Design a protein around this ligand. Structure first.
Ligand code: RET
Ligand code: RET
Ligand code: RET
Ligand code: D12
Ligand code: D12
Ligand code: D12
Ligand code: D12
Ligand code: D12
Ligand code: D12
Ligand code: D12
Ligand code: D12
Ligand code: D12
Ligand code: D12
Ligand code: D12
Ligand code: D12
Ligand code: HEX
Ligand code: HEX
Ligand code: HEX
Lengths: 206, 206, 206
């Protein structure tokens, strides 16, 4: 129905994003390229539709989006935590909480009843412990990254609760469109805005 | 039947353990918190029961316990190997053997016939090569960690063979109770006993 | 039929290879041992046959071979990239492209229609970006590794297209035999030829 158009739009946008990020940025470790490329793979699988599950109020759930975030958001968390000049051990810790948040989030979306509630509570506890050291960072770059944590990262659990993954108050297509806007904001706009600042900060403490 | 009570007990204990370890320990990389948190996730999945398989002598197998160990026991092996002051390259090697041991162990538990035997032999070869450099460590902390390798880590393959994962000589609930006691010993008591020693050793070679 | 003999041959050869590599090489991080050991696990699963899927022209596909390559070829890429003295950040980048190439390759093999084509194109783009920095390396070891990239690594996508994973022009058993020869060349002969050179190069920039 309309959902294939949402997924097809995500494949095209992140294919353009991955192509730009590779050519425009330095030919070395390119997190921006890897994040968009992983997202392309995730949208193709969601478009194939073999991994769709029943959601709330007659909606559907694509829990593999949450599993692919664990790989792509750990790369984002690496850039974010390094931008705030967290210690190496704190970076490793935050990247683990991110994998935990997405992993339990996919389980919360796929399962039902008290298991959806329990996995959501666990994922939100790990999320609270993930963003607390970032929102209270003494770094001067803290305000520059709070816009992406508060608007983008925290928009997903809210979308989750409204989507068929949670209470199913919005339909599956509306959730996919809102997920896509959140993806563009946290994966593409995030680099258009902060790449050079992150690049300069990284050539000074490495 | 009685097994849900065993899994519910594990969820409550490791939720208390994860809560204590986070608040009591330093607000940086907390392996003790991550190990217990991962174990909570594993026990909820086992309690949901969608990933249960037929075992030996009419028992059942929860092979995802073994897959989740590959993530949580690699964190334990990191602390153990660093405590014995293994080289960084030896630490990376041991963490790989741990993932191999748990991964092949989950396959041994899930499959039957000569494949259970073959996967068990492979997992035990990798296990022998994993613990040999630890039991013969020249570190003075070697005796302090041998109690957990011999009593706790080596108790799992013995429990495996008795459980429905192996010959099914004990029932599924008895195996779950014995697994839970082994979990508490190797994941919780391990830190009550060795945290400060490991913390002091780590602030001296890092 | 004949395919079990191909898989049984792979189990025996890599069991001999893993046994030799462990005993002959230094008792520290042994990539050669880990690569062969992982390959043993992969061939046993393929021999068990629960993860076989329908292929092209009545052939079959064992897509888990491609998923296990993502773990074992990242170890090979680590040795290759370190041998060419790539920077640490470039090594991490190449190991990610390898996981992407194998991951999308398993999806290309498992799915059909435009999804097989799309996943193949994505996997080949990531493959082109993976081998370009290696084939144009200014390292003097570049020619010593180009034989394995061109003959061995690039033989897999060609075999893929001929195998039931692609167009199904060759049968499943012929593909398995050709996969096995490629495995022996890139995983075993690769170390018989380059171990000491790689060992000496590694004791000079570490
Ligand atoms: C590119 C994708 C990004 C940055 C996604 C971030 C996603 C989250 C922070 C999701 C968080 C969730 C919770 C906070 C708990 C409930 C379930 C989740 C996974 C939606
Ligand atoms: C928190 C969990 C820990 C420390 C678990 C350790 C588990 C093992 C060492 C399991 C070992 C096994 C073998 C030695 C081979 C047979 C199968 C296994 C996986 C049970
Ligand atoms: C031990 C195994 C090795 C070194 C395997 C390497 C495999 C590849 C480079 C496979 C590449 C593929 C492509 C280039 C795209 C099409 C699908 C693949 C996965 C076969
Ligand atoms: C210098 C760049 C290092 C980047 C390391 C990122 C590691 C990502 C691991 C994600 C595991 C899910
Ligand atoms: C489509 C099925 C998704 C179920 C989620 C799997 C559970 C992953 C937990 C990861 C915890 C680190
Ligand atoms: C029908 C039984 C449902 C059990 C739900 C598990 C609750 C997990 C809570 C995790 C947070 C402590
Ligand atoms: C015809 C359906 C359109 C639904 C679009 C939902 C997009 C939500 C955007 C929320 C703005 C922050
Ligand atoms: C300083 C703390 C570093 C801890 C690194 C642990 C990495 C765990 C990887 C487990 C992979 C299964
Ligand atoms: C529930 C199915 C469990 C089967 C085990 C999967 C095989 C994992 C092998 C990992 C080797 C590193
Ligand atoms: C029916 C055929 C069963 C084949 C069992 C595989 C044996 C694997 C042995 C691994 C250790 C060398
Ligand atoms: C009523 C069933 C109780 C079974 C409890 C088994 C616990 C085994 C403990 C072994 C002590 C080391
Ligand atoms: C000194 C040896 C370090 C080897 C690091 C290899 C890491 C492999 C990760 C593969 C992830 C799929
Ligand atoms: C047997 C099913 C194989 C399907 C392939 C799974 C997709 C893995 C994508 C990994 C991308 C990093
Ligand atoms: C840009 C490369 C990825 C192209 C993915 C194509 C997806 C196929 C859609 C098939 C619709 C029936
Ligand atoms: C009886 C079937 C034998 C098929 C063997 C195929 C092996 C292909 C080798 C290609 C040489 C590079
Ligand atoms: C088929 C689901 C794959 C998810 C890998 C993160
Ligand atoms: C559904 C099984 C998940 C296991 C991840 C380690
Ligand atoms: C059952 C498939 C396991 C693949 C792990 C790489």
């Amino acid at each position: 129905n309309q959902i294939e158009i949402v997924f097809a739009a995500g494949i095209a946008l992140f294919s353009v994003a991955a192509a730009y990020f590779f050519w425009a940025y330095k030919k070395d470790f390119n997190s921006a390229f890897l994040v968009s490329f992983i997202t392309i793979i995730s949208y193709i699988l969601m478009l194939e539709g073999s991994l769709v599950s029943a959601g709330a109020r007659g909606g559907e759930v694509y829990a593999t989006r949450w599993l692919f975030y664990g790989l792509s958001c750990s790369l984002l968390m690496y850039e974010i935590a390094r931008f705030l000049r967290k210690s190496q051990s704190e970076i490793v810790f935050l990247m683990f909480l991110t994998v935990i948040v997405m992993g339990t989030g996919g389980a919360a979306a796929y399962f039902e009843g008290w298991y959806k509630i329990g996995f959501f509570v666990l994922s939100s506890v790990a999320y609270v412990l993930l963003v607390y050291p970032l929102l209270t960072s003494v770094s001067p770059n803290r305000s520059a990254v709070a816009k992406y944590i508060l608007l983008g990262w925290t928009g997903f659990p809210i979308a989750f609760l409204l989507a068929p993954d949670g209470f199913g108050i919005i339909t599956t297509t509306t959730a996919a469109i809102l997920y896509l806007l959140l993806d563009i904001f946290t994966k593409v706009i995030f680099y258009f805005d902060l790449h050079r600042k992150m690049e300069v900060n990284a050539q000074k403490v490495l």
